[PDB]
Design a protein around this ligand. Sequence first.
Ligand SMILES: Nc1ncnc2c1ncn2[C@@H]1O[C@H](COP(=O)(O)OP(=O)(O)O)[C@@H](O)[C@H]1O
Ligand SMILES: Nc1ncnc2c1ncn2[C@@H]1O[C@H](COP(=O)(O)OP(=O)(O)O)[C@@H](O)[C@H]1O
Lengths: 498, 498, 498, 499
Amino acid sequence: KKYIVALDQGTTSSRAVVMDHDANIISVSQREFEQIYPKPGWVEHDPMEIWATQSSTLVEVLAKADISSDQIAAIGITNQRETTIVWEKETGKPIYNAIVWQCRRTAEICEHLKRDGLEDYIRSNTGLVIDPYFSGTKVKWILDHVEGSRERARRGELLFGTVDTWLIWKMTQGRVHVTDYTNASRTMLFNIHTLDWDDKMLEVLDIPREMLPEVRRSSEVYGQTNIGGKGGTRIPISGIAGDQQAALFGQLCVKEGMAKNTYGTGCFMLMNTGEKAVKSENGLLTTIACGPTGEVNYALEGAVFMAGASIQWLRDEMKLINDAYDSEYFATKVQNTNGVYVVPAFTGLGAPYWDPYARGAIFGLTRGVNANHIIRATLESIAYQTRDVLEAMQADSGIRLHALRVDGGAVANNFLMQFQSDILGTRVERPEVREVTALGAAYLAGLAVGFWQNLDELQEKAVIEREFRPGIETTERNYRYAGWKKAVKRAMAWEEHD
Amino acid sequence: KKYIVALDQGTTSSRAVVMDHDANIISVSQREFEQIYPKPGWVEHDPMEIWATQSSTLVEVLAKADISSDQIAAIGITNQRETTIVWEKETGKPIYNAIVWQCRRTAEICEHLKRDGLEDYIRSNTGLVIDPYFSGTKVKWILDHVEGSRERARRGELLFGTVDTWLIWKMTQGRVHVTDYTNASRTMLFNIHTLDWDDKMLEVLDIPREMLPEVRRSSEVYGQTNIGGKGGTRIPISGIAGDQQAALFGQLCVKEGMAKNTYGTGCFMLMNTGEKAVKSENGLLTTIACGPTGEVNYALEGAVFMAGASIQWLRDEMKLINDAYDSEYFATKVQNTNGVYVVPAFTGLGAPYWDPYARGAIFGLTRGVNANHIIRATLESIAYQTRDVLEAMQADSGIRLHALRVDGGAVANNFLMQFQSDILGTRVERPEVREVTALGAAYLAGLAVGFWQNLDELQEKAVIEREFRPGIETTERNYRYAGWKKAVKRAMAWEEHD
Amino acid sequence: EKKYIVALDQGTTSSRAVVMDHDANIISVSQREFEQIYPKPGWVEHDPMEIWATQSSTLVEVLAKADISSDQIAAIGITNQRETTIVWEKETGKPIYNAIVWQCRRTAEICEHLKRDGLEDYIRSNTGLVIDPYFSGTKVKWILDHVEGSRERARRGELLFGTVDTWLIWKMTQGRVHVTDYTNASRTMLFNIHTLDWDDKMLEVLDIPREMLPEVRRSSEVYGQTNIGGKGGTRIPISGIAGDQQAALFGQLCVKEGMAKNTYGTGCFMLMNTGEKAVKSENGLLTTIACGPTGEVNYALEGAVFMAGASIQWLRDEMKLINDAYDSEYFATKVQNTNGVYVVPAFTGLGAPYWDPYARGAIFGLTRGVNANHIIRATLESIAYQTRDVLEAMQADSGIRLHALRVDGGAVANNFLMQFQSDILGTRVERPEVREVTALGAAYLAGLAVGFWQNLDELQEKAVIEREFRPGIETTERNYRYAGWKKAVKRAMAWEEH
Amino acid sequence: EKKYIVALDQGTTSSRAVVMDHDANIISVSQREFEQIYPKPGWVEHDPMEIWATQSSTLVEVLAKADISSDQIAAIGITNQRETTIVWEKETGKPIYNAIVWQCRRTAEICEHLKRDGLEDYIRSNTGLVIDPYFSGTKVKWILDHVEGSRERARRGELLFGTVDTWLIWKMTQGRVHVTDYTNASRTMLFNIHTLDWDDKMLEVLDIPREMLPEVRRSSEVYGQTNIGGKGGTRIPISGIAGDQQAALFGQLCVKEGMAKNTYGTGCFMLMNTGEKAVKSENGLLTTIACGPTGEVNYALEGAVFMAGASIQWLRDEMKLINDAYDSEYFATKVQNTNGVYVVPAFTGLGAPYWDPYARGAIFGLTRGVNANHIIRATLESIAYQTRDVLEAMQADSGIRLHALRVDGGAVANNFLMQFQSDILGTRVERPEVREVTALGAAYLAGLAVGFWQNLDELQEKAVIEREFRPGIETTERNYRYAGWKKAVKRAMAWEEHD
Ligand SMILES: Nc1ncnc2c1ncn2[C@@H]1O[C@H](COP(=O)(O)OP(=O)(O)O)[C@@H](O)[C@H]1O
Ligand SMILES: Nc1ncnc2c1ncn2[C@@H]1O[C@H](COP(=O)(O)OP(=O)(O)O)[C@@H](O)[C@H]1O
């Protein structure tokens, strides 16, 4: 009994990870899963595939690392936060695929609410923005979209759930219908002061309460699981959080003012705002983090929809790189983007913009622009975007951050990193372990299980493997930025409202 | 006595065709040359390299076809229209590279003029539009960049010329310094009415009249060349015309209201308006063509900067494809652009927009979008463009095309062909022989020296290879076209000038 | 309850997991490729943890993905890559050396003495085996000698040995179980095929402590149970074991004497069923245990080809000449002959009927016009060649003239291959509807065991000849191309220095 | 006045034209590759016209682009690929058949008849050539026998026979002149190297009308003029011709006995000057004619290897393994060695010291973990091997172990290869700054005639070794690797089936 196990249900892959008591990484599992675009603007995931992969990674992580059911103190869980599931309570079968948080299909529905004038209400109790991004719209969607859903829904025959929930249920044979604070926040269904489903929003979206599941603390005993092994082995489930929050947490951004920015399929920037929830005026998200004890807290969140994904697109779709990591190479074979700009609004915009109608776009093409500029453009867009939110933050925040605690798959790229310090004019912290989403999940659980007795017990745990100071002139910084800002403006509003 | 040679010094390649009296392409020779992009929006060529390749070709088609210097009746010359070259007479060495019609460096220069109510005149006098495209401002520009050029030139130390102009001089060792009408009407410098150098123009731009060459007829001995051989052999240069203008003539559009479309590096639609010059109101150019005799005729013209070039760009720069023939195969792997649009303003706008500041851009980008979608979007810009002008054409022309006739490299592409057909809803006629440009120069030089008594002998000559009636995909046309429009507006105004 | 049977295929390049219904319908498949280690030219290894880890996650995964729950599995079938040797520590359960693969050749040295020593007839007689590094014996000894004080702990109980099945079953029973079937045991070169038990002459020759040995068992029989979680007290019976080859002969219903099949996976295996008589080869073929219609020990004539689908992987992965294995046929068909080039896929020694551990891969007949495609096709070709090779011996040894070859394996997707083979043999060819005959074989057995099925014939109406390739062209070529091939071989033979 | 000499390099794969000056620098170059045609597996053909046309445009382009007038050219030097045989109609000036590339193997059969009729000794002694389908003889005859009434017209004075120097010049004199040189003429196996003239037995044995051969001349000397137009009445002396190998040797100032060079191109050639002395060789080398310090007649030991640069071109154009020959280096350095792989590149048979028309190209040591890097790498090494093969025959035959190796050719750029090479022989490898040496010879051969330069000394210090490669591999290793090759080689032999 001396291992903790984090579960990370990524946007593109399912991960499984293994730490010890000194919190190292004994092992990793990963599997990607099919991403579906039934139609341009839309994103879906197979719930079944989401599962399997997530299960198998679990099982495969121990196997290979040669660990037995028995030594697993507990299991923590983080997931991508907005994607929505709905299935028959009985058969445990989805009434429709999972709609990822990217999928813009409920834009239209958003229009309605915007118009009924719920904007202030929503910013107010949920702290969210009216976006197809959030779960509510989605649920109403399956709901309206499937024959007598609403009905079954009422007869409590159907279960609504995010990923964490779905995970756990499956996990516990349908025994446990739960989810933690953090994940509830982004549903735009649950009140954040109150701390429990906004009664108003259910009516609004026309959503039968029967369907929701209990909400709990992010750090706590929720259940157990039997994955086989040596007769009588049950594994506990003591930790749940959205990756974002997980990272935040595994980053030890446990006081107000503390923040990090993560780089994976998207970009997330979160600042801990302690016990008090700052209402943003600069196009940010107010949300729930975790205190040093898995306690409710608040946070300022800036969400970027596309980051490493552009890069995935380069390779899967554009097929211009053979592997992610190549980007560094190619992008550095030139001195600039040669006037080029990418606006990766592939799935709309996001903070601080919030533009369901924007699409992805390339700018300032000329004859002599080759592929290397493009790729490089792609990277930098990442860098701009952040700049977009960071400011917003300092705006809303009132704090002027002095360095950037980043993390994610992509922090591995040094270019992007340098580029980022430059463009920012800020220091950039690069911790020695980049799977913190996973840590935050280990941390939360084992906490819940006295695997660790408190945070501090970790503290000297977090190590900056490298830091980046800028190097470029203010003039050009702003100079390049302006370009970016203009590029943005050309993109927004592309798609037509039906 | 047996053959005539056409010479096509095209934007991207130098060429040499051998026709017989029967009007048959007996042998061919292509050579490609370097495209220089000193910087974004600028495109130069090496004048020597132009020379270089163009001589090699001629020398090459001949050998190959086992043809002796004596057997050639005349030499015709066609060329890329607007590139300016400038050299010393005493040495025949350029003070600068050829500056391309593409090249957008003289934009500032155009704003001065615009600023000086110079417009009405220019249009009036030259039938052109203020824009970086003309050798006008170009010339000037070199003059201002090279130390004490002006003075030398005044003292007639420096020669000025277009391409034909440079070729002929080169080929007649300095002996002859001349130009034809068509060409000359593309300088901004020359009066299409008058039939001679506009002084205001020469004044306004401050170009020394010494540098200009003799404007001549499109069909007329001008001199001769010595390419060795038996000995005593001298070959005459009987024909000259701007390629756009040569193509039109080779299409035998010698009567008023007869049109053609040309797709090579760029796109150029022309209409023979007979002895009367029609003034554009729709963004079109008024220019000089040839009569059925090689005599001054007038044409309305639409000009698109980027046509075949894009495929080359995907090719050389993007490397998405291996060959331009390819493109088709990729485009037909998908059934729509996935809503992605491309605007090939790599080198500014042009007809009917004229916007030296537009730069290329790709729009409606999304995650399921791949290379093919892209390649295909690329070909579509092509038809979109042609549709654009084709309409100014009919506004201006008042004539409704009951069918397009076309030519150039690109027309071998049936995707392009058929698309174009459905996009326009008009029929598209494709010849068996597509180098109708060379033909036109064959035709002129030939007509000149008695090789053929008239166009008559050449009428029975053509043959349509394919006629592209518009695929049912002629219902959804404004719809497609409409995205197009939207898209363009978004391309417009990229580069910074203020 | 219990509607499903699960086959486990632990192949040389991947591990699978297959779910059948009572109708013997693959309700789900799972794969995951795994590393191929070549510490040195001529040697192949695997990681027993990786073999494990893969095999694990697959099972878990097919289940998952198909929504089948543990309570529903009547039993589990088990198949494996046959010769590969593993040696762990009973306590820790950890290995003291990587799986050494049948392919591997480090043992020829040892093998060298055994020849030296006179051990032919015996080995062959009692084993029906030949002296070669293909078989586990030599391998074992090897590790024993390489690992320090192996023999001690070996005799002190301490170390276990196992083939794959051994290794997987040991692992799914927590160590509780240490079984093996006949089929499998035969391939060790350690155990007596007549006697039905470990041959101690051997054990003595090779100096292998019987402590470390496991128990030979019945191919169809409950050996034990596994626990993979679920509704407490859930466990699954392990009723089936076979070497995939034999495993395959069975799935294919070749349970009567004179019945054979050919299998095209990573390699090539032809086996004929000899009823209860163990026919002694005299043409380079092996004699091995097989399965009667009840799991009963039968006997077989077997031809073992080391490089078959392996070659194609080489091309794609190593030569990188291909993207997908399915590509191969396309390219090959791109040429029309191989331009007289031959490929000899002896990357891993010779194998029947030659057995030549000193031969290495080689390519012949190259010329300046020989290109990739020709080469590819040569590769494919080499497969139908090695086949015709053994097929002859089969009918030497068998004395039976097979009228049509029945086939199976992953590579039979190849129409080209299938056709070429047809022609090369000048015999018809039967492609089944399903190709996972191997996993099938395994389900059958373990299901027969647990009464899933009461008899084969139940399953007879299963098997649908999806396609039949009849011999194409005339003899002449046949023999002609063959001679070509023979030549080649002889020059492959004897490369390595020993 | 006349401030420049121009060299025409006509190679097996591309047509060149170089422009130098009095200070023998290179003002410019123009190349162009031309189609390799393989009618049948082991058959090598070229469109005479393409050879022509390419040489033309190249000549033209150098001038044109360098801004150089016919009036400025002191003369044209000429070199070519050596065995490729062209035969055309005197009237029309048209090839009766493609040009048969030296590489071509189609005449083995015929070489058989030869050996069989006891001629090995003679051929070896008057011509200095070994019986193979390498040389011109059989080619001609082949043609001859294959074209209906050729022989007839060929006596009837209507048909012409030429190597490539010869087809060029005549194409550039409008048929005025039909000449050839010592160097080239010696590779036909129809020319006696002492007598220094057309072999009768030769013509006899082979049935070739004396009436078709150009006339044999010096290497440096004025043979004609050409007119390429320009400023009226401009003529250009054609003042030099040599087989490019001999050209290289020459352009290396390889001019006294003991002096030798290795050239690495589409093939690989190694030759060493034996002065005036014609050494018959026992070790498989070639005996031929080279140039004296004045263009006078010299002699040499040649070592001819069929594929060097061509092997890579096969990776690049056929196997598509690399996209650029220069890449080679890159790839092969991603590996420490070659996983026991060996590439024997007998695409075109053997060649010295082997001499095996039946030999095919092959690959050995194949194993599962062998990737394309190893193949490329092996490819490279084969070059090094073969060199070491001829190299030895040479020391055998001449008693001298080369202290340093003077090299050149297009492939000498490959640093890897260079080094490997050093390693494999355990000899120093001198790399000149200008590797374009074949041309240079030609220029030298020309300007010299035309008195452009009066002596070679004028030319001496003009040479500079850009790089020296010393062997960095332990003897054992060195030899060890050799033995392997040697083994591989044999397996390669006699693959082909001779009825
Ligand atoms: N099959 C093809 N499909 C599409 N575009 C093509 C195709 N072939 C050539 N192109 C383009 O057409 C142009 C060559 O046409 P051409 O008319 O010969 O040149 P130019 O206008 O300068 O004289 C290049 O831009 C080339 O990519
Ligand atoms: N870096 C390199 N490595 C290997 N071969 C090279 C390299 N660079 C050029 N080459 C090769 O050298 C040959 C060119 O020979 P060169 O001396 O130019 O041509 P030629 O055949 O006419 O003598 C080509 O076959 C090319 O494949």
